[PDB]
Design a protein around this nucleic acid. Structure first.
Ligand SMILES: [K+]
Ligand SMILES: [K+]
Ligand SMILES: [K+]
Ligand SMILES: [K+]
Ligand SMILES: [K+]
Ligand SMILES: [K+]
Ligand SMILES: [K+]
Ligand SMILES: [K+]
Ligand SMILES: [K+]
Ligand SMILES: [K+]
Ligand SMILES: [Mg+2]
Ligand SMILES: [Mg+2]
Ligand SMILES: [Mg+2]
Ligand SMILES: [Mg+2]
Ligand SMILES: [Mg+2]
Ligand SMILES: [Mg+2]
Ligand SMILES: [Mg+2]
Ligand SMILES: [Mg+2]
Ligand SMILES: [Mg+2]
Ligand SMILES: [Mg+2]
Ligand SMILES: [Mg+2]
Ligand SMILES: [Mg+2]
Ligand SMILES: [Mg+2]
Ligand SMILES: [Mg+2]
Ligand SMILES: [Mg+2]
Ligand SMILES: [Mg+2]
Ligand SMILES: [Mg+2]
Ligand SMILES: [Mg+2]
Ligand SMILES: [Mg+2]
Ligand SMILES: [Mg+2]
Ligand SMILES: [Mg+2]
Ligand SMILES: [Mg+2]
Ligand SMILES: [Mg+2]
Ligand SMILES: [Mg+2]
Ligand SMILES: [Mg+2]
Ligand SMILES: [Mg+2]
Ligand SMILES: [Mg+2]
Ligand SMILES: [Mg+2]
Ligand SMILES: [Mg+2]
Ligand SMILES: [Mg+2]
Ligand SMILES: [Mg+2]
Ligand SMILES: [Mg+2]
Ligand SMILES: [Mg+2]
Ligand SMILES: [Mg+2]
Ligand SMILES: [Mg+2]
Ligand SMILES: [Mg+2]
Ligand SMILES: [Mg+2]
Ligand SMILES: [Mg+2]
Ligand SMILES: [Mg+2]
Ligand SMILES: [Mg+2]
Ligand SMILES: [Mg+2]
Ligand SMILES: [Mg+2]
Ligand SMILES: [Mg+2]
Ligand SMILES: [Mg+2]
Ligand SMILES: [Mg+2]
Ligand SMILES: [Mg+2]
Ligand SMILES: [Mg+2]
Ligand SMILES: [Mg+2]
Ligand SMILES: [Mg+2]
Ligand SMILES: [Mg+2]
Ligand SMILES: [Mg+2]
Ligand SMILES: [Mg+2]
Ligand SMILES: [Mg+2]
Lengths: 49, 31, 118, 94, 50
RNA sequence: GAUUACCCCUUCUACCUUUUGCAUAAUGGUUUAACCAGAAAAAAUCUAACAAAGAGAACUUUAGCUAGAUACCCCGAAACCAG
RNA sequence: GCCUAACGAGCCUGGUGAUAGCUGGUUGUCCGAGAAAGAAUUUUAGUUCAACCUUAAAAAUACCCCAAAAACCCUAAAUUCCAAUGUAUUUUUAAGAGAUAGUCUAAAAAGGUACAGCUUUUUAGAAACGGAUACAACCUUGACUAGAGAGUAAAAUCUUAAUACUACCAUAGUAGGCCUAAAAGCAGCCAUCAAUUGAGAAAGCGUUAAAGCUCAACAAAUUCACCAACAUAAUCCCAAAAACUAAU
RNA sequence: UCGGAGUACAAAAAACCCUCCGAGUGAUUUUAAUCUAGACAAACCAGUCAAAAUAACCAUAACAUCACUUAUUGAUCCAAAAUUUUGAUCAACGGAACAAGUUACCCUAGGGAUAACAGCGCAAUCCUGUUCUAGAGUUCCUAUCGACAAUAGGGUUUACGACCUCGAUGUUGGAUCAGGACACCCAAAUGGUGCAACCGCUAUUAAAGGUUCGUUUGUUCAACGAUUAAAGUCCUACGUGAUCUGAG
């Protein structure tokens, strides 16, 4: 848990909130070309805008 | 109205006396 | 009979120590609110339900930005026990039309214009 | 051996359930949050006179958009392809 | 009863919570509890409550 | 729910009817097969024909008339009358 | 009473699919919205209207709502009305059925025993698959499907169970006056002076009345000392247990 | 049925076999017309106000008044009168044109929506202990008692409520068998006394065992005879009728 510590440090209370663990793409092709964007990430960037 | 600052502007019964009416049964010169 | 509660104006007079405790600005009030609902509209009167509905606070734990005008503050005072209110801070200022899609709102109450550059 | 008369949470005689130390802290945590709530509402940015009709064109436009969308309610168009597309039921391989 | 009320080291008191309607407590309290300040409950008067 | 493993473990107060509220110690059912209970088009809405007129007579008409489609249960008394 | 195993009036057939505001029953899947009672009634076991609600349609304003404003003897919580603002709701027209047998909690009252899980009204809330061990009504909760991910909300053992007060020491006027059968500090009345460095015409007990004991004042001497005690039920008590390894 | 005041404290509305007043018409003359904007009220039926305009009369005249003035009243149909108009304690007062008793000889459809028996809620009534001393006790408050009052608990009595059962929870007393509580009748230990002993009164502790046989009454209860260490109080669906009895 420890959500109070995370809020003190500036991070989100939930580790799934706008952290580097969520925004970054989880998979990519071996050759190196980027993978198609996630459905969740695109939706999350529409409510922020 | 109660909450308005102009409450009680029409008060008059405290200006004149009560003037007890001369009742038919209570008519007596109570001095 | 249970009726609405009238909040006396003496409650909303801040002490000189309040500004230092909560990090407020003694001279210039902040410009925008960030309102997050905490508790439930259930087991509460109907007039509190409508005020929550008309402020865009239907879903809990979702920040919503409102002005600091007295008209909005009049409604917030009714449901001030169901919401969490924090000021909106702008370290980089207002976003422009170029950086609309890169905005992110941190938990501490500041809006970062450029988020995860490159 | 010792019973609570009637239902144990309603009536003249109830259960003696006391308040716990955890419950006291929950009340205080909510009180501290609400103490901060009534400070940020204390000092508005604009006064009552300066907000007189500051945003009314947007409010008027929002209502006009509502009227326009609600007034467009009408049955949709009917085309020949929908009626003639039913004959494709018995399409065969000759 | 005034010195014990002036030097109270507890930030929250019945007078502050009830009048300001904190936590929506007015749904539980009686309209007379605004004046009684929590020192009176029915016909019972507890003098130790501040 | 599971589990290498049927139990052992953990989590769950039968089902309808009737009620403010039924695991209730309120009602009904041993179980199986067969049989057993929503029906009407005056005004209306939807679709179409023709339109100041419509209908294959008889009528309705200040956008109306003609046609179609959309509708309203089963079991049970003590009794009453005549032969 | 008896008249073919039921006679407050036989049996059979027909009228007969008698009629029941009363009881029971009402058969595939999935999806959308969704109501607790104001008024009349041989009426309160039911119906017909109003409100609310459903389906379709038209239109513009609906909620929140500041100042001003609403009674005369005293009078609380607060309502009505209304611009801004926040927000999308509301009205009208055309079709409609259900419901009209209510339970508790908080608040203002009434009847009662300032009794009821009691009863009659008004305002508000609820009817979790979580929490209060069990739990319709209390608290946390915007009820979708799949995952062997994560953060949080209400919330789990409640306080005190309290009171020792122990040295030393007593002699004058004087049975003060009055009172009474007798009233010697000590039924009552009245006064309350006075010897001795020290001791009240008496604080308590006692005597028929006296006598006598004790307490105030001598000296001696110096921990602290207001107050806080309250019986029992019937099948068998009822998680087990624990005063400190770091808790917003 | 209709009106006024409180319950209903400040716009409206708002109940009880709730607390208090009334109305079912009189007196008088100013004998109070016709026609129409707009509204209050309201389910409906009903009820209320009302400018302008016209006529009446000071020749550019409409509120009948007084009695808390608010209530002083009745729908259709139908009947009678000239056609104008009138007609009900239809008071069960939104009114069936005209109709009572009894059923333990009873029948049917239902209700635990609604009573009697039982449980449960509550403690007025009932029971048990303590706090407070005026007094009774020759003197002496508390050996034994204790008025006016305070406080806590038990759930045995009669009530109160109508919450589970009326497609059934069988109802007094005995017979048999007893389970349990302690607020103990006896048996054991002990404090106090207005306890010399004997016989007593009172309080604390203890529930393993025990608590009789007969006359009258259906009786539980009560009276009486004889006796016993004593012939306890109460709960258990006032235990126990798929074990019996049926006197009531
Ligand atoms: K109870
Ligand atoms: K039954
Ligand atoms: K039934
Ligand atoms: K059934
Ligand atoms: K009926
Ligand atoms: K004397
Ligand atoms: K009637
Ligand atoms: K009672
Ligand atoms: K029964
Ligand atoms: K015994
Ligand atoms: Mg219970
Ligand atoms: Mg409680
Ligand atoms: Mg249940
Ligand atoms: Mg019932
Ligand atoms: Mg129902
Ligand atoms: Mg059953
Ligand atoms: Mg039944
Ligand atoms: Mg059966
Ligand atoms: Mg038709
Ligand atoms: Mg007949
Ligand atoms: Mg015949
Ligand atoms: Mg026969
Ligand atoms: Mg039938
Ligand atoms: Mg009703
Ligand atoms: Mg209706
Ligand atoms: Mg205002
Ligand atoms: Mg408005
Ligand atoms: Mg009904
Ligand atoms: Mg009720
Ligand atoms: Mg009730
Ligand atoms: Mg309600
Ligand atoms: Mg639970
Ligand atoms: Mg959700
Ligand atoms: Mg001395
Ligand atoms: Mg005792
Ligand atoms: Mg145990
Ligand atoms: Mg109106
Ligand atoms: Mg005129
Ligand atoms: Mg008729
Ligand atoms: Mg009537
Ligand atoms: Mg009426
Ligand atoms: Mg008739
Ligand atoms: Mg007889
Ligand atoms: Mg019968
Ligand atoms: Mg009922
Ligand atoms: Mg019985
Ligand atoms: Mg009974
Ligand atoms: Mg029972
Ligand atoms: Mg009691
Ligand atoms: Mg005496
Ligand atoms: Mg008592
Ligand atoms: Mg009942
Ligand atoms: Mg009732
Ligand atoms: Mg049965
Ligand atoms: Mg017996
Ligand atoms: Mg026994
Ligand atoms: Mg004892
Ligand atoms: Mg003995
Ligand atoms: Mg019995
Ligand atoms: Mg018997
Ligand atoms: Mg038998
Ligand atoms: Mg039996
Ligand atoms: Mg007999």
């Amino acid at each position: 848990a420890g959500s109070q510590w995370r809020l003190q440090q500036g991070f989100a209370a939930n580790p799934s909130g706008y952290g580097p663990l969520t925004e970054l793409p989880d998979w990519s092709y071996a050759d190196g070309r980027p993978a198609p964007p996630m459905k969740g990430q695109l939706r999350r960037k529409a409510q922020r805008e | 109205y109660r909450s308005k600052p102009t409450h009680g502007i029409g008060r008059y019964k405290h200006l004149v006396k009560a003037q007890e009416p001369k009742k038919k049964k209570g008519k007596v010169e109570v001095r | 009979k249970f009726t609405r509660s009238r909040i006396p104006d003496k409650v909303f007079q801040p002490s000189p120590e309040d500004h230092e405790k909560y990090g407020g600005d003694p001279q210039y009030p902040h410009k925008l609110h960030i309102v997050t609902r905490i508790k439930s509209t259930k087991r509460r009167p109907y007039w509190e339900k409508d005020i929550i509905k008309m402020l865009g606070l239907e879903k809990a734990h979702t920040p919503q930005v409102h002005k600091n005008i007295p008209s909005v503050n009049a409604k917030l005072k009714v449901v001030k026990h169901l919401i969490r209110i924090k000021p909106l801070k702008l370290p980089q200022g207002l976003p422009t039309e170029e950086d609309m899609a890169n905005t992110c709102l941190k938990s501490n109450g500041e809006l970062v214009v450029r988020w995860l550059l490159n | 051996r010792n019973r609570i008369p009637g239902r144990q949470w309603i009536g003249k005689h109830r259960r003696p359930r006391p308040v716990s130390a955890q419950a006291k802290q929950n009340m205080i945590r909510r009180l501290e949050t609400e103490a901060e709530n009534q400070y940020w509402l204390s000092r508005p940015f604009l006064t009552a006179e300066q907000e007189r009709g500051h945003a009314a064109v947007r409010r008027a436009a929002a209502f006009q958009a509502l009227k326009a969308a609600q007034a467009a309610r009408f049955p949709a168009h009917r085309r020949l392809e929908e009626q003639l597309g039913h004959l494709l039921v018995t399409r065969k391989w000759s | 009863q005034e010195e014990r009320e002036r030097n109270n080291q507890n930030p929250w008191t019945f007078e502050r919570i009830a009048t300001a309607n904190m936590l929506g407590i007015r749904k539980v309290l009686s309209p007379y509890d605004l004046t009684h300040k929590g020192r009176y409950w029915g016909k019972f008067y507890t003098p130790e409550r501040v």
